[PDB]
Amino acid sequence: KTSFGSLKDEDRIFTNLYGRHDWRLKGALRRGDWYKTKEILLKGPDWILGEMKTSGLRGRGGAGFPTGLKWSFMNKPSDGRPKYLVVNADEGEPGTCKDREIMRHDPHKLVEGCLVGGRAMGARAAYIYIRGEFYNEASNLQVAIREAYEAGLIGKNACGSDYDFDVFVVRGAGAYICGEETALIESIEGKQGKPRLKPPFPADVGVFGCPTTVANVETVAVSPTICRRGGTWFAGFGRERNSGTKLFNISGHVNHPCTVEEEMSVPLKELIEKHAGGVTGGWDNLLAVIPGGSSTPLIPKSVCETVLMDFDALVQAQTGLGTAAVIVMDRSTDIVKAIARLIEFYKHESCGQCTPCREGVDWMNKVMARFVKGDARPAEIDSLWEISKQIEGHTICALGDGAAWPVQGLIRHFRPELEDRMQRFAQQHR
Amino acid sequence: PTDTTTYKNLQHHDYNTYTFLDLNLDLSKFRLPQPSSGRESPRH
Amino acid sequence: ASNLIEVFVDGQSVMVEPGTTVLQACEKVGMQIPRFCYHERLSVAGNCRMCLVEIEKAPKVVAACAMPVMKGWNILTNSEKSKKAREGVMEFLLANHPLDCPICDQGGECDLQDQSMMFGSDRSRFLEGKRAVEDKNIGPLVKTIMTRCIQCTRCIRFASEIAGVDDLGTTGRGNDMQVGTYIEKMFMSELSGNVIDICPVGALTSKPYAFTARPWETRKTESIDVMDAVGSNIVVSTRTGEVMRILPRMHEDINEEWISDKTR
Amino acid sequence: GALFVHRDTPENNPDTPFDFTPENYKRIEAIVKNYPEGHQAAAVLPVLDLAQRQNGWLPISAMNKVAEVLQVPPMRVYEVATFYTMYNRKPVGKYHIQVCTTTPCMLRDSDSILETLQRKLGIKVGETTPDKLFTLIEVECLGACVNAPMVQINDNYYEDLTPKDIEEIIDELKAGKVPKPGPRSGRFCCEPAGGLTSLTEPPKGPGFGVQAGL
Ligand SMILES: Cc1cc2nc3c(=O)[nH]c(=O)nc-3n(C[C@H](O)[C@H](O)[C@H](O)COP(=O)(O)O)c2cc1C
Ligand code: SF4
Ligand code: SF4
Ligand code: SF4
Ligand code: FES
Ligand code: FES
Ligand code: NA
Incomplete structure (x- = not known):
């Protein structure tokens, strides 16, 4: 099909998204969780990884890597070391709150997803790393894990499948950088959340120096349904190579900020109007959208008219899908101050390990603060563009890249707005 | 059919400072024996 | 013999053992990659990013000190992307560095000064204020002027691995990350004075030697x-x-x- | 402001009394057993967090105790305590108010919440009330942006706030009552206000749409 959207409730995965049904095991069973799990497990690693490959599912943490290929790096004979699945529940990207709802209302989807995914990789346990601020969610997830242990669904002889699996919850202590896949591993190991260089890759040398796959909560949570309902069903949504459903956070200047599950490649305009109640003051009041969370560049209103919300369509718009966290700014917004506060976030979140982000992001932050007042000259706009290109591609981890792109999105689409402030500031003093 | 008009995630209003680590303590009995690297530590 | 593999440094064939890094392959053709955090006798750190070098047909530059060479790679140590990476990294190092060379004991035998001369730009475009950190007292032998530190972590790796003293580390994060002991504590190993040599900048200097030469x-x-x-x-x-x-x-x-x- | 060097004071020095209560020692050995044998430095972040839940904050003696209990070097515990922003290396109020001011919240007027809290408590961000019952700070995104503007107070989130709503929550805490986490706008969590636009139909039950041969 060429038109996407209007997902039906029968096709939705996260059926207790809004917490209107029981989130404990009794409710989860009624909604179809933990159904025929033993059958899925006994079909083996190769079959499970086949379903994920066929579905075309891609990473939901931000980078959108094909999940089935990534999870197959663990499909290798062991070397005497234990194997581990880490579930990334750090969820720290501004604008993103989708993983939070999964853990508090559908915790048994995640636990089963840990087992099915852990089995496919051949792992012995799952470590779920949840941000420390999500204390109530972390406690909901532990209650669900205890219920699954009591019901025999995890632990020794999981689901009666003669396969042992553990599900540990470890809490973070406040660092956005610990959502980066190798910084998360270091934080589990008791160190500062500083990312590792690659190689080695986690599937070779990971947590405790052992083969590891770090997967996003949303990636892990939808896997059991892909196995039950098949990869063909999941591949029936969204454009080719961008398939499946997706959770969207719409925040900022909308009438009804919300979280909603929708099909991939849905038009961005349709998503805001149908679910979020439209832009505050009408579609004509729209200024710019950040379509994938803070790390993705903003797009202007002209691009937003026809852009589809999937991985490839937003790449052609010079932005990215990211965490599918849509942030909306209407024409009353100070666009410069909005992006400057995002640079301020990245400056507060840099781990400090590597030079270009330790120094560069702090440098960009200071220049942006002067751009907000207009206390600069237009020759500095190209200077800031070059500085951001010196960070991008030159850092250990993608935080540095994610700090550069917001600046580039502002310079690309709102250069006249910056130059206009500089003109007003110069005449306001001269 | 479920009521699906009230909010059914209200247990967390009664959680306290040690709710998480009490569940972790309670969950120790179900865990499986951990693997060993062979040394008491990397020697600090 | 059979394990040796072929790589190229600017088109010249080199046979290297498996696990040899890109930095080490260039050494075998007599080409020294610029570095700050890397030291051959310490664990690889890969944090300064001064060793970034372009691999032909790969769009992302690689950290030569940490990246193992793959068969058939052609390492372009003098390509425009390599050179622009070095200029960008050097510019970041010098942004908050203090204008201390006349009063700094490292002056004239400084790797920051020299690799700036050989690989950096010739001017500054940084128009802000600079960071300044307070100084730690770690004993009568090593003077600390930590505003000059470039966060290379060589001292931390020397203290942990060579000296077996886990008392150096980093506190904070971001631009505010500080190398030190956190508490007031002395660095008095029998090998402690070697941090003066391996510190690439004048952050760690010899108290007895100070200002004399x-x-x-x-x-x-x-x-x-x-x-x-x-x-x-x-x-x-x-x-x-x-x-x-x-x-x-x-x-x-x-x-x-x-x-x-x-x-x- | 917030320094990352420790300097001794009478109230915070290596001899400031700290120990884990016997109940909390049972909780430590459960934490440690979550990890492979010989990899118990992994327990630093939870154990260090437990010391703060017992104590409210972390003096240098509490960090020193964590290092001894886990037999890690103290500098490795200091590195952790200064990296992660949720560790309080100075004492905090009874209620640690944390207001998100990142852009998604800022667009929905987190500035008004911060202004109301300052004038109501009569302090500025980063300060503690003289009676030592509230500390006020600004924080980065707390992962609740659809429910903006919002604050965290200890372990609870209070969301969809207005200046009038935040004043009520402050009155309840002065009284001694627990306000109640969640949105203060009428909705229950993250649903669109004005009725669900999805998941209005009953869930489809076990076995629905299962592929054949499973
Ligand atoms: C600064 C930074 C923060 C990140 N934060 C998260 C996060 O909070 N949650 C997440 O699933 N991924 C996050 N990622 C992406 C992860 O590094 C990783 O790609 C992902 O968690 C695992 O792959 P997956 O999405 O395919 O499952 C972050 C990356 C960076 C550079
Ligand atoms: S890019 Fe920033 S967050 Fe990532 S390793 Fe480098 S300094 Fe740390
Ligand atoms: S460390 Fe080198 S560049 Fe820095 S002040 Fe001293 S001599 Fe100059
Ligand atoms: S003090 Fe010297 S050796 Fe230590 S991190 Fe700083 S620059 Fe590197
Ligand atoms: S020498 Fe390679 S990054 Fe420092
Ligand atoms: S921007 Fe405030 S909770 Fe995300
Ligand atoms: Na030196």
Whole structure:
């Protein structure tokens, strides 16, 4: 099909998204969780990884890597070391709150997803790393894990499948950088959340120096349904190579900020109007959208008219899908101050390990603060563009890249707005 | 059919400072024996 | 023999063992990659990013100190992308660095000064204020002026691995990350004075040596230590008929790159 | 402001009394057993967090105790305590108010919440009330942006706030009552206000749409 959207409730995965049904095991069973799990497990690693490959599912943490290929790096004979699945529940990207709802209302989807995914990789346990601020969610997830242990669904002889699996919850202590896949591993190991260089890759040398796959909560949570309902069903949504459903956070200047599950490649305009109640003051009041969370560049209103919300369509718009966290700014917004506060976030979140982000992001932050007042000259706009290109591609981890792109999105689409402030500031003093 | 008009995630209003680590303590009995690297530590 | 694999440094074939890094392959053709955090006798860190080098047909530059070479790679150590990576990284290092060279003991034998001359730009476009951090007192031998530190973590890796003292670390994060001990504490290992050599900048300097000499002045006399029976190879720096300081002289089979604090 | 060097004071020094209560020692050995044998430095972040839940904050003696209990070097515990922003290396109020001011919240007027809290408590961000019952700070995104503007007070989130709503929550805490986490706008969590636009139909039950041969 060429038109996407209007997902039906029968096709939705996260059926207790809004917490209107029981989130404990009794409710989860009624909604179809933990159904025929033993059958899925006994079909083996190769079959499970086949379903994920066929579905075309891609990473939901931000980078959108094909999940089935990534999870197959663990499909290798062991070397005497234990194997581990880490579930990334750090969820720290501004604008993103989708993983939070999964853990508090559908915790048994995640636990089963840990087992099915852990089995496919051949792992012995799952470590779920949840941000420390999500204390109530972390406690909901532990209650669900205890219920699954009591019901025999995890632990020794999981689901009666003669396969042992553990599900540990470890809490973070406040660092956005610990959502980066190798910084998360270091934080589990008791160190500062500083990312590792690659190689080695986690599937070779990971947590405790052992083969590891770090997967996003949303990636892990939808896997059991892909196995039950098949990869063909999941591949029936969204454009080719961008398939499946997706959770969207719409925040900022909308009438009804919300979280909603929708099909991939849905038009961005349709998503805001149908679910979020439209832009505050009408579609004509729209200024710019950040379509994938803070790390993705903003797009202007002209691009937003026809852009589809999937991985490839937003790449052609010079932005990215990211965490599918849509942030909306209407024409009353100070666009410069909005992006400057995002640079301020990245400056507060840099781990400090590597030079270009330790120094560069702090440098960009200071220049942006002067751009907000207009206390600069237009020759500095190209200077800031070059500085951001010196960070991008030159850092250990993608935080540095994610700090550069917001600046580039502002310079690309709102250069006249910056130059206009500089003109007003110069005449306001001269 | 479920009521699906009230909010059914209200247990967390009664959680306290040690709710998480009490569940972790309670969950120790179900865990499986951990693997060993062979040394008491990397020697600090 | 059979394990040796073929890589290319600017088109010249080199046969290297598996696990050899890109930085080490360039050494075999006599090309020294710029570096700050990398030191061959310490664990690889990969944090300074001064060693970023372009691999032909790959769009992302790789950290040469940490990246193992793959078969058939052609390492372009002087390509425009390599050169622009070095200029960008050098510019970041010098943004908050203090204008201290006249009063700094490292001046004239400084890897920051020299790799800036050879690989950095010739001017600054940084129009802000600079960071300034407070100084830590770690004993009578090592003076700290930590505003000059470039966060390379060489001292942390020396203290942990060579000296077996887990007292150095980083506190904070971001631009505010500080190298030190957090609490007031002395760094008094028998090998402690070697942090002065391996610190690439004037952040860690010799208290006894402070302000007495410049490196272009000194005459170097290669000699041996007699404070113990190890026979560590040293350099005796003299000026105008006076001994100024003692440096280690590399000898792989005796003292490698280090001396003891009595020797120093 | 917030320094990352420790300097001793009478109230915070290596001899400031700290120990884990016997109940909390049972909780430590459960934490440690979550990890492979010989990899118990992994327990630093939870154990260090437990010391703060017992104590409210972390003096240098509490960090020193964590290092001894886990037999890690103290500098490795200091590195952790200064990296992660949720560790309080100075004492905090009874209620640690944390207001998100990142852009998604800022667009929905987190500035008004911060202004109301300052004038109501009569302090500025980064300060503690003289009676030592509230500390006020600004924080980065707390992962609740659809429910903006919002604050965290200890372990609870209070969301969809207005200046009038935040004043009520402050009155409840002065009284001694627990306000109640969640949105203060009428909705229950993250649903669109004005009725669900999805998941209005009953869930489809076990076995629905299962592929054949499973
Ligand atoms: C600064 C930074 C923060 C990140 N934060 C998260 C996060 O909070 N949650 C997440 O699933 N991924 C996050 N990622 C992406 C992860 O590194 C990783 O790609 C992902 O968690 C695992 O792959 P997956 O999405 O395919 O499952 C972050 C990356 C960076 C550079
Ligand atoms: S890019 Fe920033 S967050 Fe990532 S490793 Fe480098 S300094 Fe740390
Ligand atoms: S460390 Fe080098 S560049 Fe820095 S002040 Fe000293 S001599 Fe100058
Ligand atoms: S003090 Fe010197 S050796 Fe230590 S991190 Fe700073 S620059 Fe590197
Ligand atoms: S020398 Fe390679 S990054 Fe420092
Ligand atoms: S921007 Fe405030 S909770 Fe995300
Ligand atoms: Na030095």
